[PDB]
Amino acid sequence: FHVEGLIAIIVFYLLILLVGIWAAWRTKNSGSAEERSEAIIVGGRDIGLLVGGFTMTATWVGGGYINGTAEAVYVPGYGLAWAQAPIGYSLSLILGGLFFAKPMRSKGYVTMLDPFQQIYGKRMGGLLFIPALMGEMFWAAAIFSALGATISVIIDVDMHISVIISALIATLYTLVGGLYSVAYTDVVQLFCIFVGLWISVPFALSHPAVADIGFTAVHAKYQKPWLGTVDSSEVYSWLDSFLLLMLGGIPWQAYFQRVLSSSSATYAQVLSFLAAFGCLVMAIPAILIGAIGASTDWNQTAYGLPDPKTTEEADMILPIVLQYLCPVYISFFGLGAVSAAVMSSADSSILSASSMFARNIYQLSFRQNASDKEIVWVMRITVFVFGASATAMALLTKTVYGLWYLSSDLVYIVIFPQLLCVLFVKGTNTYGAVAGYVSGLFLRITGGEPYLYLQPLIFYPGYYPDDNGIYNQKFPFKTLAMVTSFLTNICISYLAKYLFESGTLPPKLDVFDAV
Amino acid sequence: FHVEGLIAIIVFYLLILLVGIWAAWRTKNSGSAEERSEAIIVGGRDIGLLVGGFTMTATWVGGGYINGTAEAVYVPGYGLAWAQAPIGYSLSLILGGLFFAKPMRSKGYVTMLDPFQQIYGKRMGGLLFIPALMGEMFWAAAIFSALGATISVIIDVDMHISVIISALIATLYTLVGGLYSVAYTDVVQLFCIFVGLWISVPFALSHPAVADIGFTAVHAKYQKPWLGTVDSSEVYSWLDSFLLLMLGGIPWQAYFQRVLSSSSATYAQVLSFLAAFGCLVMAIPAILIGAIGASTDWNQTAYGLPDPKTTEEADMILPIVLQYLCPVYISFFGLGAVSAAVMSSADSSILSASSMFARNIYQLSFRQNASDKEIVWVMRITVFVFGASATAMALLTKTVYGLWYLSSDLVYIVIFPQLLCVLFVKGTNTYGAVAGYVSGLFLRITGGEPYLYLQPLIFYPGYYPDDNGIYNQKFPFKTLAMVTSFLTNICISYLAKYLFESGTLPPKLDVFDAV
Ligand SMILES: CCCCCCCCCCC(CCCCCCCCCC)(CO[C@@H]1O[C@H](CO)[C@@H](O[C@H]2O[C@H](CO)[C@@H](O)[C@H](O)[C@H]2O)[C@H](O)[C@H]1O)CO[C@@H]1O[C@H](CO)[C@@H](O[C@H]2O[C@H](CO)[C@@H](O)[C@H](O)[C@H]2O)[C@H](O)[C@H]1O
Ligand SMILES: CCCCCCCCCCC(CCCCCCCCCC)(CO[C@@H]1O[C@H](CO)[C@@H](O[C@H]2O[C@H](CO)[C@@H](O)[C@H](O)[C@H]2O)[C@H](O)[C@H]1O)CO[C@@H]1O[C@H](CO)[C@@H](O[C@H]2O[C@H](CO)[C@@H](O)[C@H](O)[C@H]2O)[C@H](O)[C@H]1O
Ligand SMILES: *[C@@H]1O[C@H](CO)[C@@H](O[C@@H]2O[C@H](CO)[C@@H](O[C@@H]3O[C@H](CO)[C@@H](O)[C@H](O)[C@@H]3O)[C@H](O)[C@H]2NC(C)=O)[C@H](O)[C@H]1NC(C)=O
Ligand SMILES: *[C@@H]1O[C@H](CO)[C@@H](O[C@@H]2O[C@H](CO)[C@@H](O[C@@H]3O[C@H](CO)[C@@H](O)[C@H](O)[C@@H]3O)[C@H](O)[C@H]2NC(C)=O)[C@H](O)[C@H]1NC(C)=O
Ligand SMILES: CC(C)CCC[C@@H](C)[C@H]1CC[C@H]2[C@@H]3CC=C4C[C@@H](OC(=O)CCC(=O)O)CC[C@]4(C)[C@H]3CC[C@]12C
Ligand SMILES: CC(C)CCC[C@@H](C)[C@H]1CC[C@H]2[C@@H]3CC=C4C[C@@H](OC(=O)CCC(=O)O)CC[C@]4(C)[C@H]3CC[C@]12C
Ligand SMILES: C[N+]1(C)CCO[C@@](O)(c2ccc(-c3ccc([C@@]4(O)C[N+](C)(C)CCO4)cc3)cc2)C1
Ligand SMILES: C[N+]1(C)CCO[C@@](O)(c2ccc(-c3ccc([C@@]4(O)C[N+](C)(C)CCO4)cc3)cc2)C1
């Protein structure tokens, strides 16, 4: 059982819990006494540059970002060219810092939905809250499932117990404390994941069993080369994936909660670049470990004859190299690193979802008149209930990954064009917003779901048949949908504004405010 | 001749020159119009945290810090344990940030010597200026010589031409601009050295000729192991070297010019830690390259049979691996990295020396009444003349390295105890300062000079005979001298204060101000 590993894990958990408790103690004079909700939600709009950069780049890298890259590098047929997580995340952060998040700090805003609830109606603000909430919960569930799998592989510990303990730790953090506590925990977690991941590269590379990883990047050894060039017949799919990972990670409440906490705007502008650099630095060891796993031969290690690819467990290729190609005291460090990244991403996501709901649904839509104590108690109970819901989804269900992918898709397709319209273009009244949202949502769900083999419905050129024969798509409908939403929103909003201006349609049926 | 390399070098030089010119253009409204000297010297006391950290950690790493570490790792009999540059620099920065540089920013100060000229007399302020000036010039000369050797090895270019061009570039930077221009150049130079050094590690490691670098760390292959454990009979020397590199890099005008430019004190406090982290990150590839050079066999590479150790050119072990174990387009990148680090350290040192002199010797000691234009012209001519002097010393002399070591020693032994006394303890009048400085200086020069085989004079236990038979020392006299200076300064200052207080010695002979 290696009781030393369990003791180290529990004392590390207690140490980060003590850090969170100290942060909660420190967070007692943030602002005056009648803005407790706003204070706990946005940290009092006062953090340092380094602390913000560290907490944000710890938020983005959360274990799934490591495992997906490692698996994509390792699994034959994907290669390195199909592991678009590093470049996608880095360029998404760079684009966000360049274009967005400067106006967000320019105005006095609390969450992502505040501009939306200000421009459109309260109904529209409550309606756009569903996709982002679903995406954040699904992401947290997937991250928790990945952590459970890693724990179960590393030590003979039940997945349920590990995920329950880690999630309870996350709720005990983000319930007793808010943004301050979560950022102070993420600062330590960043260093934990760095010292864990970057220290296991020389250990694995110098293994006698492993071959020359440079020879396999252009030649074949035990399998197809791990570089993985993309064929010309699938360039559209690669561009679609790049666009999704480039423009679908920017309209996330985790990003906007951290930008709307710096004392100024240039602080957040350079925070984005620091986060991108940290994301690249974190992605490098994952790529290296994936390459090591791809360019090594089993039947000489403690694993045995059947490779991970045949046994269909390549989703956890990282904690398999970290276990069978490194000593025990390096394996425990890497497990701690993965757990710390998972905890950081999970707590950040759950706090962002709670911050979105317990304000933009409760005090601006349902109870416009409520005491600060009531709202803070709603805050504290909402963090717990949403964490419990994410835990139940992660533990009692097995289709979490595909649902998470679909939820991220939906978040991108819905929020990003609407965020672009509300932040950059003028006009963009709710009359066109409803039509754009409906069109994008229905076009995406009719675009085809190939993971859960649910329904292809509308056929697009390419007609790719999977194992079940369900027709898969090739056209970039995942981004055609976003562009369709953008143009239809602009056109319909301007048409409504022009028709109202000319008086051709009677103002009697003006349901919303566009006169 | 590889004209592509020369073209790349000259266009890189022109690019950084354009960056410096743009910085000089930007630095035109720093403060009001009657503080031109103070503005050009301390950057207007307004820089960002990231810019300050980057410029400072680029200042510390300057090519010599790389070559010395690589040579110490490579040369047999030294090993890794005797390469105390990384830990020494990092802990010096950490100690500085913790203890010093908070009071420096607390008071309104311009250079290191301002507290000294304020507490002691103008004569004492002018007297302590000599050692730091000599140390900075000697360091710049050594760095320039190292760059010349690297250029001469990489390309068939005369050393004189390369050092002249690089030094002229440095003067053209720090003459047209001050702290702002030097920091804006160092920011780009940091990224240049990073992308140069850290990109040549996988290229050299994957060489067919090189052996397993992990096997040679505890075993012997072609030579003694490159780890290099320190014998128990030389522990005192190791502790002496560690103390020198730990407490002798803190009282340097390069450090205090960069701390006395941030808008606050916590900015500099965390700037020190950022600099230490950057220094460690820069030191890692140097250690790796030294290990690669130590654990590789010639007679299979383009070099030939005689190893660098036998030919006695191990001082440039880094640009030898970078040349014969990497392709041409990686060798040029590494050469650019080394040149950028050299330029950063040289320009920082020359600007610090000019800032010290042209203020604390000229406007507070000689011409108390002078126009701002006169002082700025003195600034601009002093930068050029000191750069030319450093260039002449680096080019026309061959004993630069040992003189630089002795100058750093002297700077440590003299400044650091006096800085400690003036910054921390009370009393410490000039009456004891004179005695402490004289005692430390004479004790150090009588402690023995083993490099230039000049004079051992006073014998200390150990009686180590070198090739010439000159007795070398073992006792930690290099730190005994500093502790002797500290205690004698404290004791003599307090004795003078007590004697003045009691009236036992008549106040007629009170030369200085201690009544
Ligand atoms: C500046 C930055 C880089 C610095 C380091 C550069 C060099 C890296 C060296 C890597 C290194 C140390 C680990 C990393 C330390 C440094 C971490 C630094 C982190 C921070 C940067 C890898 O050695 C490690 O341990 C095992 C070897 O010991 C090896 O395999 C083992 O464990 C697997 C898992 O449990 C598992 O499959 C199985 O048990 C093994 O297969 C592991 O895969 C490996 O991780 C080198 O160790 C060298 O490897 C030698 C065999 O080549 C090894 O045996 C040699 O000596 C023996 C007598 O001592 C002698 O009897 C042997 O005959 C001789 O061969 C020695 O240990 C050592 O000489
Ligand atoms: C992080 C940013 C930087 C990344 C840089 C990545 C590229 C680095 C260079 C690529 C590289 C490292 C791979 C590293 C993997 C991990 C990378 C990612 C890590 C981070 C995620 C692998 O290159 C592989 O090496 C093979 C040999 O092992 C070689 O030949 C194989 O395929 C052939 C058909 O193509 C086939 O005919 C052949 O039979 C195969 O054997 C191929 O080039 C290739 O397969 C090293 O190769 C570089 O070039 C030379 C060999 O080409 C190598 O030696 C040569 O040049 C010396 C100097 O001039 C000089 O002595 C000699 O001319 C010669 O000895 C260099 O020393 C090395 O530097
Ligand atoms: C992959 O794993 C297989 C496991 O079967 C390795 O097979 C090895 O084959 C050699 C050659 O026959 C065996 O050596 C001799 O085997 C006999 C039994 O037939 C034994 O009595 C002798 O004492 C001697 O060991 C070897 O045992 C066998 N390995 C094992 C574990 O039994 C094979 O080499 C591996 N590598 C590949 C296929 O690349
Ligand atoms: C270190 O360098 C020496 C260079 O002399 C290497 O010596 C090599 O020795 C082999 C074995 O004799 C030579 O192979 C044969 O040499 C004869 C000449 O005696 C030649 O006519 C044959 O065609 C064949 O090449 C080899 O040439 C020779 N190397 C050279 C460059 O001449 C030695 O192997 C190297 N490595 C060590 C000592 O570990
Ligand atoms: C996260 C990714 C998208 C960006 C950061 C990593 C890349 C900059 C690295 C990762 C792996 C590297 C590759 C690994 C191996 C090789 C083979 C190497 O050798 C050959 O192709 C054979 C000919 C030769 O040796 O020159 C050339 C560099 C290349 C393509 C490397 C180019 C740079 C790559 C793509
Ligand atoms: C700049 C320095 C002072 C600090 C940063 C680098 C060190 C943390 C690294 C550099 C080289 C490393 C060493 C390189 C090789 C080895 C051999 C390695 O294997 C053995 O000693 C044999 C037994 C075994 O394999 O466990 C153990 C780790 C060790 C000492 C490493 C320990 C960590 C070291 C000292
Ligand atoms: C080939 N697979 C293994 C199957 C699915 O396609 C993939 O290429 C893929 C595509 C997108 C993702 C993805 C993951 C997370 C997110 C996310 O919502 C998560 N964050 C919010 C954490 C940051 C980025 O946005 C978006 C896209 C993951 C895997 C990976
Ligand atoms: C064994 N050798 C090769 C011979 C001399 O002893 C060494 O260990 C050694 C000792 C100290 C140094 C040293 C170099 C620079 C400095 C410096 O003045 C330079 N900076 C101001 C740049 C930072 C540190 O302080 C101090 C000590 C260099 C080499 C190296």
Curated annotation (Swiss-Prot), chains A, B:
Membrane topology designation: Multi-pass membrane protein
A Pfam family the protein falls into: SSF
Post-translational modification comment from the UniProt entry: Phosphorylated.
Effect on the protein upon substituting residue 416 to V: In CMS20; uncertain significance
Cytoplasmic topological domain: 26-46, 101-123, 184-189, 257-272, 337-374, 426-433
Positions of disulphide bridges: none
Nuclease in keyword set: no
Tissue: Expressed in putamen, spinal cord and medulla. Expressed in cholinergic neurons.
CDD domains, alphabetized: SLC5sbd_CHT
Extracellular domain ranges by topology: 1-4, 68-79, 145-162, 211-235, 294-315, 396-404, 455-479
Effect of residue 63 to E: In CMS20; loss of choline transmembrane transporter activity; no effect on localization at plasma membrane
Carbohydrate attachment residues: 299
Effect seen on changing residue 289 to T: In CMS20; uncertain significance
Any Gene Ontology biological process: synaptic transmission, cholinergic
Effect listed in the UniProt record for changing residue 449 to Q: Decreased choline transmembrane transporter activity, only 5% of wild-type choline uptake activity
Family: Belongs to the sodium:solute symporter (SSF) (TC 2.A.21) family.
Stated role: High-affinity Na(+)-coupled choline transmembrane symporter. Functions as an electrogenic, voltage-dependent transporter with variable charge/choline stoichiometry. Choline uptake and choline-induced current is also Cl(-)-dependent where Cl(-) is likely a regulatory ion rather than cotransported ion. Plays a critical role in acetylcholine (ACh) synthesis by taking up the substrate choline from the synaptic cleft into the presynaptic nerve terminals after neurotransmitter release.
Quaternary structure and interacting proteins, as annotated: Homooligomerizes at cell surface. Interacts with SEC14L1; may regulate SLC5A7.
Domain text: The C-terminal dileucine-like motif (DKTILV) controls SLC5A7/CHT1 internalization in clathrin-coated vesicles to early endosomes as well as choline transporter activity.
Pathology noted in the entry: Neuronopathy, distal hereditary motor, autosomal dominant 7: A form of distal hereditary motor neuronopathy, a heterogeneous group of neuromuscular disorders caused by selective degeneration of motor neurons in the anterior horn of the spinal cord, without sensory deficit in the posterior horn. The overall clinical picture consists of a classical distal muscular atrophy syndrome in the legs without clinical sensory loss. The disease starts with weakness and wasting of distal muscles of the anterior tibial and peroneal compartments of the legs.
Protein name: High affinity choline transporter 1
